[PDB]
Design a protein around this ligand. Structure first.
Ligand SMILES: Cc1cc2nc3c(=O)[nH]c(=O)nc-3n(C[C@H](O)[C@H](O)[C@H](O)COP(=O)(O)O)c2cc1C
Ligand SMILES: Cc1cc2nc3c(=O)[nH]c(=O)nc-3n(C[C@H](O)[C@H](O)[C@H](O)COP(=O)(O)O)c2cc1C
Ligand code: NA
Ligand code: NA
Ligand code: NA
Ligand code: NA
Lengths: 386, 386
């Protein structure tokens, strides 16, 4: 089974992604990874040599074994003592201001619950791993998944921003793959010019007020065959798996498949996607279901929406308690941006790609790309022969 | 690790739930299971001896091994040939009208994608397993989880209905455990009398029009300790795990933790739950996060909302294709109700309970309830001693 794991602290030496269970023969390079990492940095309101492929790829082709990708920390020299792996003289450490105690947990962040859970008197060990810097390692892994999906299935994954702050949501038609350059060129990764202007204005107002914004993003996967995922149990359903992968992204508080919560307000006669005869099989005129029925891909674009909360580190830090003393306090000062919704969209693409690649390998099997491709072709033919 | 699996076809001999990895010493009986199964049948707009505990429980106490619970099918005699496990003479079968071909997949259901996936020319094998009858087996498993949560942690799980059809959503405060009798006595399992009347009216109108409705439900878990789930990776986050467990319920198209999509429309200064000193530790005046931060329980009520689509089997069957011929068709006639939202709420409680019980055993360990309880107490004391 395809599996992915990330490791690293935000201010540690490096991040590492490991992908296991990918077939041999998938073309992917350090440049591909760097390109996707650059996309994760996109957005209004927020070193390529830092990527090193350590294992599992040779001459731009996957080997079949575990793929380990390292992302170096360019500011490691500042953190090499505070985040040293090995012991440091506590006296030396005591003189380092940067090592000062972090005992005022931020509302909305992992700090408080993680400190209690792990018995830590300091937030440092929690925030270092909880930080969304970890999504960089996710994107490295996702690049391997996305290469596989393209090469094996002709599938493309993209995202666009639906709303930021109080903007009027974009409810027009979703983009296609050919639209991604324009989307990534938008300061807010919008597919609609009116929505773009509205969102930029919301960010400007928040920026002036010293506040932060969340938003809603939609990931779209195009070209999927029918029958990835299964109805046979809750955990094998693709909607279940996608919901896990997307809700587990930092700051995501909501996930929808297709029209989601709006579907719940509709009558059955107007809520589903009717089927009609077509040249090359069944066709539909709507995609309210977002490309999934009974936990399976149904031929239509997959559409997954995610709601991101506004960043919790607000420049003037919110009210909290100093756990050292029990006193009222203002929260620890940390990384804050006005809005990270466009980047959150890119992270959603990655998690969607990983889950789709896993599901594809489950159905089509194979140990090399050519093998998997033969199996895909035979299945497609069998469906066509219906 | 706590694991659950369901087995059975809707019209097969019986359903089976198996729960593995539950500690010994949890008090649970066949009557408890039957009671929860009865709750799953609640709701306007839709045999206890049928429950048999086969293994893993002795004299009302779990043994520590796998717990297998059987739910018999009272109409098995009608289906004993059509759904026979063993071969039947095809000539005999050919004379049975009930065995007629089902080749007109229902929009919105598993039929089409499942038929293509598995290479079936008939929807019968798909709909039999995809059917929400399977949620009965889930509820049997969930009963074991819910007993554990109560006995080990003093935790209660309940649900109420927020909206059905075009009703004005209930946005008042959530219920407590003591409110469940009143909720379960409501025809639509509402906690608010105005919302109740509104929802009942929506159902009446849909029923008259021969249409179906979906809705939104909220599950609440009370009494949870801080620090279940973890921030250490996406898959260990409780929000991820809950999203998987809830989205994998038949007809769920959206999941929120706390204020969800509405949170995405708020400014950071008004989106999070500030912390204040209190007698027995940190207290909060809001629970916008729904009891989770950084993938961990944070002391506040857990709140999970789920959007259920209107049932897809509409009495006058929607437009589809007959896969046998390629012709336009009306969809296969099957079980339809006007609204199953109240029952969907009960199913959400079960999936929440299962995930919470698993997370609790991950942190607190133990092989018997008394052992787990000692470990819980020691952790609580260590937190108090802060
Ligand atoms: C791309 C990305 C960037 C983020 N940047 C920040 C940030 O700069 N400051 C912050 O407080 N939270 C940021 N977050 C969110 C926190 O990491 C997150 O809220 C925290 O780990 C608690 O997890 P939860 O919000 O999922 O409960 C970011 C999230 C993502 C997806
Ligand atoms: C309690 C419960 C009862 C349901 N009853 C029906 C029903 O009677 N008829 C129907 O078409 N769908 C019913 N459903 C929904 C279908 O099982 C579901 O839409 C189908 O398996 C396709 O899965 P998906 O909607 O998750 O894509 C019910 C769901 C639940 C939770
Ligand atoms: Na679409
Ligand atoms: Na190959
Ligand atoms: Na609450
Ligand atoms: Na015991």
């Amino acid at each position: 089974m395809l599996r992915w794991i990330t490791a690293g602290e935000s201010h540690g030496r490096a991040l590492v992604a490991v992908v296991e269970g990918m077939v041999a023969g998938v073309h992917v390079t350090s440049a591909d990874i760097a390109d996707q990492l650059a996309r994760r940095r996109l957005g209004y309101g927020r070193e390529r040599d830092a990527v090193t492929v350590l294992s599992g790829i040779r001459h731009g082709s996957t080997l079949g074994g575990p793929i380990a990708i390292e992302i170096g920390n360019t500011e490691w020299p500042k953190w090499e003592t505070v985040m040293a792996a090995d012991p440091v003289d506590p006296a030396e450490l005591a003189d380092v201001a940067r090592n000062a105690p972090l005992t005022r947990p931020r509302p909305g962040h992992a700090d408080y619950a993680g400190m209690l859970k792990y018995g830590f008197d300091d937030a440092r060990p929690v925030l270092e791993r909880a930080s969304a810097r970890e999504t960089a390692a996710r994107v490295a892994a996702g690049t391997v998944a996305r290469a596989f999906l393209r090469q094996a299935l002709g599938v493309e994954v993209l995202s666009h921003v639906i709303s930021i702050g109080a903007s009027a949501p974009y409810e027009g038609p979703p983009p296609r793959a050919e639209d991604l350059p324009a989307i990534d060129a938008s300061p807010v990764r919008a597919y609609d010019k009116a929505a773009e202007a509205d969102m930029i204005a919301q960010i400007e107002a928040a920026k002036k007020d010293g506040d932060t914004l969340g938003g809603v993003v939609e990931a779209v996967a195009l070209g999927l065959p029918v029958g990835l995922g299964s109805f046979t149990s809750g955990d094998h359903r693709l909607d279940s798996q996608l919901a896990a992968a997307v809700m587990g992204i930092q700051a995501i508080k909501g996930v929808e498949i297709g029209d989601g919560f709006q579907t719940a307000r509709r009558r059955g006669s107007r809520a589903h996607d009717e089927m009609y005869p077509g040249p090359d099989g069944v066709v539909r005129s709507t995609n309210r279901a977002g490309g999934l029925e009974g936990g399976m891909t149904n031929g239509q674009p997959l559409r997954v929406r995610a709601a991101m909360k506004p960043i919790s580190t607000v420049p003037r830090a919110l009210a909290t308690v100093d756990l050292a003393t029990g006193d009222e306090a203002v929260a620890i000062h940390q990384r804050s941006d006005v809005c990270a919704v466009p980047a959150a969209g890119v992270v959603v693409e990655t998690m969607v790609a990983l889950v789709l690649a896993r599901a594809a390998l489950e159905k089509f099997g194979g140990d090399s790309l050519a093998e998997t491709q033969r199996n895909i072709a035979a299945y497609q033919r069998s469906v066509a022969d219906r």
